Amino acid sequence: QCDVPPNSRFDCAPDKAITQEQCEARGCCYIPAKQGQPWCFFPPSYPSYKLENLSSSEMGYTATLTRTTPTFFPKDILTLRLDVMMETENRLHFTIKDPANRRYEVPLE
Amino acid sequence: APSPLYSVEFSEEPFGVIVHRQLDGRVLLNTTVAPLFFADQFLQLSTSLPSQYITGLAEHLSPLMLSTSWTRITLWNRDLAPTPGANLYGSHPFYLALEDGGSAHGVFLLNSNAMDVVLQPSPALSWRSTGGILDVYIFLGPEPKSVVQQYLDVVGYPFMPPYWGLGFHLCRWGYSSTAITRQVVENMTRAHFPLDVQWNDLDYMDSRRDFTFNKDGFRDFPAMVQELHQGGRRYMMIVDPAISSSGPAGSYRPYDEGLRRGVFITNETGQPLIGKVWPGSTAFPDFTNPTALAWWEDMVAEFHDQVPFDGMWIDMNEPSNFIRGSEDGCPNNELENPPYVPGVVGGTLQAATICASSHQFLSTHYNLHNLYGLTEAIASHRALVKARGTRPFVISRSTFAGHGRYAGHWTGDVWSSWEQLASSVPEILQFNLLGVPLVGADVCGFLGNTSEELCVRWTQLGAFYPFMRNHNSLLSLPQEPYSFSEPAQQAMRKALTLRYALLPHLYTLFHQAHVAGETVARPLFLEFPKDSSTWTVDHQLLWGEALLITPVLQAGKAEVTGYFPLGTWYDLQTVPIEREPAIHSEGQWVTLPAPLDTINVHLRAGYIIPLQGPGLTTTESRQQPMALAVALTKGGEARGELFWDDGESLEVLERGAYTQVIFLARNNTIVNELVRVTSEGAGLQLQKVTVLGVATAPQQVLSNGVPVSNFTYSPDTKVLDICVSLLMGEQFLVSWC
Ligand SMILES: *[C@@H]1O[C@H](CO[C@@H]2O[C@@H](C)[C@@H](O)[C@@H](O)[C@@H]2O)[C@@H](O[C@@H]2O[C@H](CO)[C@@H](O[C@@H]3O[C@H](CO)[C@@H](O)[C@H](O)[C@@H]3O)[C@H](O)[C@H]2NC(C)=O)[C@H](O)[C@H]1NC(C)=O
Ligand SMILES: *[C@@H]1O[C@H](CO)[C@@H](O[C@@H]2O[C@H](CO)[C@@H](O[C@@H]3O[C@H](CO)[C@@H](O)[C@H](O)[C@@H]3O)[C@H](O)[C@H]2NC(C)=O)[C@H](O)[C@H]1NC(C)=O
Ligand SMILES: *[C@@H]1O[C@H](CO[C@@H]2O[C@@H](C)[C@@H](O)[C@@H](O)[C@@H]2O)[C@@H](O[C@@H]2O[C@H](CO)[C@@H](O)[C@H](O)[C@H]2NC(C)=O)[C@H](O)[C@H]1NC(C)=O
Ligand SMILES: OC[C@@H]1[C@@H](O)[C@H](O)[C@@H](O)CN1CCCCCOCc1cc2ccccc2c2ccccc12
Ligand SMILES: *[C@@H]1O[C@H](CO)[C@@H](O[C@@H]2O[C@H](CO)[C@@H](O)[C@H](O)[C@H]2NC(C)=O)[C@H](O)[C@H]1NC(C)=O
Ligand SMILES: *[C@@H]1O[C@H](CO)[C@@H](O[C@@H]2O[C@H](CO)[C@@H](O)[C@H](O)[C@H]2NC(C)=O)[C@H](O)[C@H]1NC(C)=O
Ligand SMILES: [Cl-]
Ligand SMILES: [Cl-]
Ligand SMILES: [Cl-]
Ligand SMILES: [Cl-]
Ligand SMILES: [Cl-]
Ligand SMILES: [Cl-]
Ligand SMILES: [Cl-]
Ligand SMILES: [Cl-]
Ligand SMILES: [Cl-]
Ligand SMILES: [Cl-]
């Protein structure tokens, strides 16, 4: 589970200095660098979101994404909506949003 | 076959978006590589990268190709003199990734929150944003130039500058009177240095306030600017966003009227957030408020009625604050003290700016900060259209993705150092990839004191910045062209003369940027992506497809080694303007002679470039006869084009108020093909045709079937120089044998 090549380790403690015990308590892997590369990193089993109810539209796809285990950040949005729009032959566009709340979006024409 | 260039599939658990290139099955995006995080103030989406070669993610002082060695790139608009590892004035959350074989794709995250982008050597990337949503565009190319165009299809094609905006601009902090400012123009003119645009910094203002001029050194400010116009020049001056809040009520209309109309960013109690900038206490306009836009339009139009300036230099629009947050500090809340602080200089979102929880019309400053400069540029573009009725010219410090649709950029407070001269090339290329082709650095450098040698080399390279301005700090030694030794003045004059000769070509390149999402200054890898030796080249640049510039970027050098892609490259020194003549490259590094008086410029075989005769302004140069430089392939072929309009009207392409001509060389003939001919362009005189790569002396040269008045052939350089009397807008045939 923690046998991840050093260059493929994604940081499980981007937010603060962490001890081995705190890292393992987050459900992460603790392997010091031999000399930067994160010492605390996600195993492949680290809880993410699950895709549910993938559906086809004329534009592309829609789905629900569900997180069941909280992260170490406050205010996880546990239910997300995925929208995939096949806009042109060379432009693919997808959004991930909170279906229960309008969130800030950049004004664009 | 009708089908997208991409295919998409999804991982169920853990969730991921997988995007393949359909043609070769290459994995471009794969977000399964790391968990998806989506919390109120923390979004993280990761992907594999197709290669170790990735560019974008402005604004930072770095090589064009970003390091994948555990690099944290922070997007949080910040007033800081360019230095590596630091969040600078702008934020552009777009990358272009190269693929083995020379295809490419691009990714845009449409998110304006403070963010870190983390690159690792697997290779992989993580977007880490502090708010908003994940709004992701993938552009399939496959050519790097197509990726850029596809990105600009979403964020906006570059605006078309006025022709005069491509001339030389001269500024400093410290021209403390109209008398001194006039002497700059006099001194440039006496020494035969072209100058289209005279600038002032905050020297003009009354007590360092916008929309004022002092009645000491600048009492006759209106007359100075009218006189510049009488001589065929334009005038630019600095505008700050911050508005003096401390003056007696009714004594300072920009503040008094801004207060009446509620144009300012407000705090918790709904009063204007007060910071400290140049005039002392200041309020900050909210350029997301439609009423602030109307107010800004009015302040610019009213000031333009006093002093007819030709554009706006918008500085300190991060927005920059001399104190942290406000005079009243900032409240303790989750926006001021978020759970994840990206790698910003100073360790807080408040450093050198305003409170994150401050109120704007559309949202909090937390969400809108990275758009502050862009919103001011949009407001200023609109203000200048309404005030002047011709194309706006806005040069902005702070930028965001899509900035180039409205304005240009300069790279800020660069040191007068050989390292910053060198660093300016990748940075100008990067802004072109991001759709801000009107970009340059302060020629000879801003901070500290330039040397004469540095200022020669910087003027040489800077003459190939699409935006060319020499600007200088208050305590610096003078660095105007005329302030140097005679030999240095000659080298600087030659650089400006060559730029002015090339302006019809540079203007045509801006036309292609505006109508087709093309780059103006472009890295070799955009033009020759299938040659992997080009991928790391960022100390050379192209103008468009055909003009390769190889500058000296180090002290004490009399040669330079540059990469030459496969083909023939003619030394532009063989073209007459008022050492091998050809480099025959297999795709290789070539050491070129480069004495102090020289910058290497080569013209690609197969291209024709239009040139125009000399002038100390574009008002003068645009009246001169034109010339063609025709760079033949071994097979005798070349192609080029000219776009011409009145240089400053709005809606030219929509109204059809332009001339467009194609030039073709084939079988010892040169012709024009008339795409569009109108009154703007009709009387353009062609008086000289210079043909490069003519293997044998011709016996005769004809223009429209009659032996020409005069021609010269040089057997040593293989150049045929032809005198003609032709019109760009009427079909001609030039032939030799
Ligand atoms: C994945 O989607 C399923 C199915 O949802 C249904 O079909 C879709 C195409 C949409 O039209 C939906 O609006 C529609 O509900 C979801 O499972 C469904 O969950 C709902 C809500 O919990 C269930 O409703 C219940 O129905 C029973 C009687 O049949 C009532 O007694 C309850 O009061 C309640 O209304 C529904 O039965 C259930 N349907 C199935 C087939 O299981 C599912 O929640 C969704 N997954 C996620 C994570 O969103
Ligand atoms: C929101 O912004 C307003 C300004 O638009 C802030 O107003 C300022 O409030 C402070 C008190 O908190 C005032 O300071 C006081 O000034 C008087 C003398 O002028 C002095 O005698 C007091 O001891 C004190 O220093 C300050 O004058 C005032 N500024 C202005 C321009 O009126 C307000 O505090 C801001 N609110 C928050 C929560 O940040
Ligand atoms: C930039 O140069 C100025 C001025 O330098 C002096 O005058 C020039 C003509 C040149 O001959 C120099 O060698 C001279 O020393 C610097 O401002 C001076 O700074 C020194 C030391 O800090 C101070 O004692 C002088 O009085 C200043 N002189 C003036 C006219 O202001 C400035 O420091 C230089 N900037 C940098 C970053 O090196
Ligand atoms: O418009 C000037 C300049 C442009 O030329 C440049 O191109 C552009 O990128 C930056 N601007 C603003 C510079 C702000 C520096 C203040 O630095 C502390 C500072 C310096 C300074 C220097 C001279 C006099 C007064 C001050 C001052 C007064 C109060 C508070 C701070 C200061
Ligand atoms: C997308 O990335 C994911 C995760 O790195 C890859 O899935 C893993 O592939 C390895 C090797 O095939 C398997 O042993 C793992 O079980 C997979 N992990 C998961 C989480 O499924 C996946 O191969 C990549 N997809 C493509 C098309 O490259
Ligand atoms: C314009 O050039 C003039 C002439 O060279 C400059 O005036 C001289 O400046 C030096 C100071 O550097 C004085 O010692 C001389 O007395 C001046 N000579 C004359 C003939 O007036 C002038 O400063 C230049 N102005 C600008 C703004 O560059
Ligand atoms: Cl430990
Ligand atoms: Cl924790
Ligand atoms: Cl690299
Ligand atoms: Cl005018
Ligand atoms: Cl609103
Ligand atoms: Cl909001
Ligand atoms: Cl090489
Ligand atoms: Cl080399
Ligand atoms: Cl030269
Ligand atoms: Cl003729």
Numbering used by the authors:
A (entry chain G): 81 to 115, 123 to 196
B (entry chain A): 204 to 781, 794 to 952
What is the paper's account of this structure, in its own sentences?
Further outlined in this paper are the identification, from our libraries, of GBA1 and GAA inhibitors and comparison of the two datasets yields a set of hydrophobic, N-alkyl-deoxynojirimycin derivatives that inhibit GAA, but not GBA1. The binding-mode of one such compound, which we consider a potential lead for the development of pharmacological chaperones for Pompe disease, is provided by means of a co-crystal structure where the inhibitor is bound to the active site of human GAA. Of the thus identified rhGAA versus GBA1-selective inhibitors, we found compound 15 of particular interest. It features a branched apolar phenanthrenyl (PNT) group, which apparently negatively impacts GBA1/GCS inhibition and it might be worthwhile to explore this design in more depth with the aim to identify selective GAA inhibitors. With the aim to prepare for such future studies, and with the thought that structural features of branched N-PNT-DNM 15 may be further optimized in a structure-assisted rational design program, we sought a co-crystal structure of a proteolytically digested form of rhGAA (Myozyme®) with compound 15. The rhGAA nucleophile Asp518 interacts tightly with the iminosugar endocyclic nitrogen. Beyond the iminosugar moiety, the alkyl chain of N-PNT-DNM 15 establishes hydrophobic interactions with the rhGAA side-chains of Met519, Trp376, Trp481, and Phe525. Finally, the side-chains of Phe525, Trp376 and the rim of the indole ring of Trp481 provide a hydrophobic stacking platform for the phenanthrenyl moiety of compound 15, which in turn makes further hydrophobic contacts with Leu677 and Leu678, located at the entry of the large groove leading to the rhGAA active site.
